[PDB]
Amino acid sequence: GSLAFLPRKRAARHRGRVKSFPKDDPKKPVHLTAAMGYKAGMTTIVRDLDRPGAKAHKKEVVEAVTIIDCPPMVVVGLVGYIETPRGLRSLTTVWAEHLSDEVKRRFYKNWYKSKKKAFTKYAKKYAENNGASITRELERIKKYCTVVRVLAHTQIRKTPLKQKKAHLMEIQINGGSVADKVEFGRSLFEKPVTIDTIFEKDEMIDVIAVTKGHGFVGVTARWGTKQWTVARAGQMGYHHRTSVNHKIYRIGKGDDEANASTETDLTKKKITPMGGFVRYGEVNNDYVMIKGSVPGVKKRIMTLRKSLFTHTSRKALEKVELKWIDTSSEFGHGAFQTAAEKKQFMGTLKKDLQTS
Amino acid sequence: DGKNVYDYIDPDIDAKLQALEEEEERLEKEGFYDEDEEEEEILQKAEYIREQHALIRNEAKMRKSLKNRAIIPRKAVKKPLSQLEDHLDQLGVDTEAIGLRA
Amino acid sequence: MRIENCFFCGRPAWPSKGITFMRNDGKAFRFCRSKCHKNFKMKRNPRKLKWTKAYRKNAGKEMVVDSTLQFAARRNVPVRYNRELWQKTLKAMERISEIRARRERVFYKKRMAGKRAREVAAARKLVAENEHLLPRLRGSEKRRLAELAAERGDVEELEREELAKLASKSKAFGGEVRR
RNA sequence: GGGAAGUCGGCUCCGUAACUUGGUACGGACAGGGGAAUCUGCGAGAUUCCCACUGUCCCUAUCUACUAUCUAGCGAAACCACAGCCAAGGGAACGGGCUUGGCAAAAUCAGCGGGGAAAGAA
RNA sequence: GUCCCUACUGAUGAACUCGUCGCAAUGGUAAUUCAGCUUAGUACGAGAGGAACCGCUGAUUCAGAUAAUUGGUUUUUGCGGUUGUCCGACCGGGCAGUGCCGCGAAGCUACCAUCUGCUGGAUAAUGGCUGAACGCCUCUAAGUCAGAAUCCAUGCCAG
RNA sequence: CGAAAGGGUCCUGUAAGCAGUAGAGUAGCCUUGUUGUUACGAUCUGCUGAGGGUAAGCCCUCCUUCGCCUAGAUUUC
Ligand SMILES: [Zn+2]
C-alpha cells in the first residue's frame, strides 16, 4: 500500500472535516467555501462532449454521475479565529437566535428524555438587553480576528432519512475584510442558503467523506498483496478521504418538476429513479449531480468544498451539455424511464380491468 | 416520452394526422369506444363454497402428518358434549331437542 | 441518441443497457439484459417464450394493424431541419400516444370479452353440485329467532335478514389445556 | 471436465474371359463417425467450426482428514533464577542488569508475518 | 548425532461534569513512464532524412475510492423445468447433509467495470553579475542572480 | 415507532380448475356410415405477462388497519 494513508485507522468522526479551506484575500467578493449534502445514489447519462483534441470530440459519451440530495442549509452562528504563534485559535463564537430542534438534537445525545434546555439562556441574552454583550462579541470578531467562519446545519427533516439529528459545520467566508465577513454572516443569520448559491454548474469541487467500512480484513484486501512498512491485518474501510477535482455537472432545483429533462429529451421527469433510489428513497430537494465515483455509502453525510487552487486543466473550463439522465429502476434490469412509458409499452392488465 | 422524434419525423404529416382524427371521429360515430344482483349473489355463494373446500382441505392437511404415523382410532378417543353440540349446531340442528343421553 | 429495441424480447434498449453480439456474417445482435443474452446463447425461440413481443404478436395478444403503428418507422432518408416540423411532430406524437392507449384498451377489452359468462356458468355448476356447504344458520339461532318472532308477531324475513347479517359479518386450531 | 507447455499431431478388393497353381485384361465397389452451429424453401437441403499424444504444469469436480468466536457450567498441562522498549559503547567475533543517549502515563481485546533457538573450526 | 513477555498492526478505555464546534506539536507523506496531435515535413541538410519550447489528448505502472452500467458469484433455496423414492391418486409437498438444471434481483466483487490523483520556497553539478586578493585578470574572498525528477514544507492521513 | 395491508419497482415465466370437438390416439351402441353415435384421452388453445416472491441492508402511505409511548436502574462537579 501507500505509506501516506497510514495509520490505517477508523475515522474519528462520522461527519468528516475539511482540514483546509482555500487561502483568503480581501480583493475577491465575499463568499462561502463549503456546503453539505447526502449521497442519494448514482446514475448514467450521455454528454455531447466538446474536448478539442479528443477522439470523442463532438460525440456522445456515456458517463456515471453521483447524485447528492442537498436541502438548503441554515446559518445559526458565526465564529471568529485569531492568529497566534501556536496556530489559529477560536477567539469567540456568537450564535443565532431561535435555534432549531434538529441542531439542538445535534447538541443532545438522549434528546427524548432531556428537558430540551439548550441555548435558552442565550436567547434570553438576545432578548433581555444583553444585546450589548452580543454586539461586543461581534465587534471583538471585527477588530481582532483574521479569518471568519459561519456555523451552518443541514435539514434532515427534509432529507428522506430516519435520522432526526442534524449536522453542524463551519463554512469559511472568503473575499473581503473581516468587517465585511462579519456583516455578511450576521445578515445570513436565521436564513436558508442554497447549493446553487454556494456552487454552480461546470465547477469542479472537492468532496470530503468517510469511505465505507468492511471490518477486520486481512492483508490480501487491506493492501493488495499477492514494522509500519509491513502489511498487517486490521481494520479495512471506514476511512476519512478528501477526493479532489470532481466536475459539478448539474444542480437541480427540486421544485422544477423536470429535473431530469434536457434540451434534447422533452420528458417531464425528475431525478429520482423509477421506483426510488435503492435504500435511500426519493430526492425532493435541490440536488447536485457530479461526475464519477465519490467516497461514502448512500445516505452518508458529505462535505462539498471549493477547490484549494485555481485549476490547471481544460476539463475545468468546459461547459457540460447533457443529453439525457437515466431514471430506470436501480432495483434490477430496468428499461422504462417512467411508469407511463411502462404502461404504454405493456398495454392494459387484468388488475387494470378489475380496479376500473 | 420513450419515443424517437426522428422516427416520427415525416414531411407532409398534416394530411396523415387529419386522416387520423377523421378516422377517430368515425370510430366514435359508429361506437367503437361505446362501453357496454342474482349473478353477484350466486358468485358470492360460489366464493363461499370455495372457501369452505379449502378450510376442509386445511383441516385435512393439519391432521394428515407427513409419513404414515399410527393414529389411535376414533372409537378409542372420547369426544365432549360441548364439541359435539357446537358442530351439530353449526350444522343446523336443535341440540336442545335431545342430548341428556350422555 | 436513439432508443433501441431488444432483439429477443422487444423492450426499449437504452444506452448502456445490454450486450451487443457481432456475428461473423455481419449482423448485430442487441440485447437489453443478460437474461435475453443468455436465452439467445442457449438458442431458445423468442417466438416460443411467452414473455416476448414476438410471441405476443404471433399469438395475437397485441394490435398489429393500425395507423397509430404505421405512423412510426425507421427513416433512412433525412429531412432538412425545420422548427415548425419538429414542434408539430411532438404534438402529433402526444396525440398518437393517447390514441394508441385508447385503441389498445379497446383491443384488450375485445380479447377479454367473454369471461363473465364462463365464470357464472362455473358458479352455477359449483353451487348446484355443492348445495350442502352453503350458509345454513345455526340451531340455537333458529330457536332464538322463533322466540323473537313470537314476541314480535315474520319468521321467514327475520331469518333471511339475520342470515344476511351473519354472512356480512375464522376457526382457530385447538385451545388452551386447563392447568 | 477445462486451460496451459512440448511435439515428427491438426488439412485396393469381388465377379467375368483367355494364359501357365499363380498371374494377365474387362466390369462393379472401396480409397467414415460423432458433436456444435449458420443460411434458402423436414427438404439430393447448402455452408462454417472441434476431434492427437505426452514420464509436464495449473484450475475445476468427488472422496478422505484436520479444520471454530462468544456465553452458562466444568476445567488441565508444557514451561517458570528474576526480568522483559530501543541505538551506540562496553579489547577476550559476550550482553539482560553497566556508561549516555532516544525516551517513557493506568487497565485491557484481537491479529501476528520479528526477538526471547542454535555453531566450534580443520 | 540436545505457551507466555515483548515489537508491530488495528480495536476499547478510568480520572479532568457531559456535550458540540475547532486548533495543530509531532509522526507519516506519492505519484510514475510512454505515446499520439500541433509546432512541421519546419529549423538543419547535397541527399537520405529530420527535431524541439509553448499548447492539446490519451495510455503503462502505482495509489485512493466507487458500483449507474457490464460480466462473474446465489441459501432470495425467489421462480420454473427435471431424476429416484415417498405422503392411496389430483393438488400441494418431504427426503437425496443445498438431488440436478435454467434464469435470477439484493449484496459482494472485477485495470473483467467506472472515477480521482494537487504547488511554494531553498539547493547540488553548472552557468552568471559586481569586484578584491595580485595596479592585468578572476562566478568569491565581502555581496549577489539563475538552476535537477534533489531537500524542506502546503495540498493529503493520524491527532 | 412497530406489525400488517395497499400501490410502485424488480425476479421468474403463464398457477389450480374449467371449457372448445382443435385434439394424435384408446374402446362400446345399433346397423352400414354417403357427416353415424357415446365415453376416456396425451398434446394444443382460451380464461392467463397469469400465478408466485418482493427487504430480510428496495421505494411511498392522509385520518389504509391494529398496537405502543412522558418509563425503571446506576453514576456525575
Ligand atoms: Zn430484452
Beta bridge partners of A288: A68, A251
What DSSP string runs through B16-62? HHHHHHHHHHHHHHHTTT----HHHHHHHHHHHHHHHHHHHHHHHHH
The grid coordinates listed for C108 are 384488450
CB-based contact (8 Å) between A268 and chain C?
Answer: no
| C27 nearest nucleotide via C1' and CA | D38
Q: Name the resolution in angstroms.
A: 2.8
Question: Helices marked H in chain A — which ranges?
Answer: 101-107, 120-127, 131-144, 178-188, 195-198, 219-222, 339-346, 350-355
Of C11, C90, C97, the CB nearest to A344: C97
Q: How far apart are CA A215 and CA A223, in angstroms?
A: 14
User: Nearest Cα to C30, choosing from C60, C44, C10?
Assistant: C10
Q: How far is CA A265 from the centre of its chain?
A: 28
Residue type, position A137, single letter: E
Beta bridge partners of A60: A48
Cβ contact C7:C52 at 8 Å: no
Name C10's Cβ contacts closer than 8 Å, sequence gap at least 6: C52, C53, C54
Cβ contact A106:A167 at 8 Å: yes
Question: Helices marked H in A251-303 — which ranges?
Answer: none
Burial class (CB in 10 A: 0-12, 13-18, 19+), A219: middle
Q: How far apart are CA C43 and CA A190, in angstroms?
A: 66
Other residues' Cβ atoms within 10 Å of the Cβ of residue A4 = 5
The grid coordinates listed for C106 are 379497446
Q: How far apart are CA A282 and CA A154, in angstroms?
A: 17
| A281 nearest nucleotide via C1' and CA | F59
The grid coordinates listed for C97 are 400516444
Distance from CA of B42 to the nearest CA of C (A): 7
Beta bridge partners of A150: A78, A171
Cβ contact A22:A308 at 8 Å: yes
Q: φ, ψ for residue A318 (rounded to 5)?
A: -95, 150
A14, A174, C135, C140 from B94: Cα distances, Å: 74, 94, 16, 6
Chains that touch C (3 or more CB pairs under 8 A): A, B
The grid coordinates listed for B99 are 342430548
CB-based contact (8 Å) between B80 and chain A?
Answer: no
Other residues' Cβ atoms within 10 Å of the Cβ of residue A117 = 9
Q: How far apart are CA A287 and CA A143, in angstroms?
A: 38
Handedness of CA B19, B24, B29, B31 (dihedral sign): positive
Beta bridge partners of C30: C20
Report CA dihedral (B54, B60, B61, B65) to the nearest 10 degrees.
Answer: 180
Beta bridge partners of A69: A38, A287
Q: How far apart are CA A14 and CA A213, in angstroms?
A: 12
User: Nearest Cα to B41, choosing from A207, C112, C150, C134?
Assistant: C134
Residue at grid coordinates 424517437: B4
User: Nearest Cα to A321, choosing from A42, A52, A45?
Assistant: A45
Q: How far apart are CA C138 and CA C159, in angstroms?
A: 11
Residue at grid coordinates 504563534: A85
Angle between helices B81-90 and C139-152 (to 10 degrees): 60
Cβ C53 to strand F below 7 Å: yes
Q: How far is CA A1 from the centre of its chain?
A: 29
Q: How far apart are CA B34 and CA B15, in angstroms?
A: 27
Handedness of CA A70, A71, A72, A74 (dihedral sign): negative
Q: How many residues does chain B have?
A: 102
Of C73, C89, C134, the CB nearest to B5: C89
Contact at CB, B53 and C133, closer than 8 angstroms: yes
Q: How far apart are CA B69 and CA C33, in angstroms?
A: 50
User: Nearest Cα to A78, choosing from A178, A157, A209, A156?
Assistant: A178
Residues in chain C with CB shorter than 8 Å from the CB of B43 are: 119-120, 123
User: Nearest Cα to A293, choosing from A81, A115, A39, A107?
Assistant: A39
Q: How far apart are CA C91 and CA C84, in angstroms?
A: 11
User: Nearest Cα to C175, choosing from B82, A206, A38?
Assistant: B82
Beta bridge partners of A148: A80, A173
Q: How far apart are CA A131 and CA A77, in angstroms?
A: 15
Cβ contact A231:A222 at 8 Å: yes
Beta bridge partners of A301: A38
Residue type, position A40, single letter: A
Q: How far apart are CA A78 and CA A92, in angstroms?
A: 9
What 8-state DSSP symbol labels residue A236? E
What 8-state DSSP symbol labels residue A281? B
How many angstroms separate the most distant Cα atoms in chain B? 97
Residue at grid coordinates 451487443: C20
A121, A348, A356, C36, C56 from A351: Cα distances, Å: 61, 9, 8, 27, 19
Cβ contact A282:A260 at 8 Å: no
Cβ contact C68:B27 at 8 Å: no
Number of H helices, E strands in chain C: 7, 4
Q: How far apart are CA A290 and CA A40, in angstroms?
A: 12
Q: φ, ψ for residue A84 (rounded to 5)?
A: -135, 160
CB pairs under 8 A between A and C: 46
Q: How far apart are CA B17 and CA B11, in angstroms?
A: 12
Mark the breaks in chain C: residue after which each occurs, C to N over 2.5 Å: 153, 169
Cβ contact A316:A205 at 8 Å: no
Name A43's Cβ contacts closer than 8 Å, sequence gap at least 6: A64, A65, A67, A271, A273, A325, A326, A327, A330
Cβ contact A336:A328 at 8 Å: yes
What 8-state DSSP symbol labels residue A303? E
Residue at grid coordinates 467516497: A295
Distance from CA of B77 to the nearest CA of C (A): 16
Q: How far apart are CA A165 and CA C55, in angstroms?
A: 54
| A232 nearest nucleotide via C1' and CA | E9
Residue at grid coordinates 428522506: A160
Cβ contact A41:A276 at 8 Å: no
Q: How far apart are CA A340 and CA A353, in angstroms?
A: 17
* Cα three-residue angle A330-A334-A337, rounded to 5 degrees: 95
Q: φ, ψ for residue A108 (rounded to 5)?
A: -95, 155
Q: Which residues of C118-136 are buried (b: 16+ CB within 10 A; e: fewer)?
A: eebeebeebbeebeebeee
C9 labelled as ligand-binding? yes
Residue type, position A89, single letter: R
Other residues' Cβ atoms within 10 Å of the Cβ of residue C110 = 10
Residue type, position C35, single letter: K
Residue at grid coordinates 465585511: A180
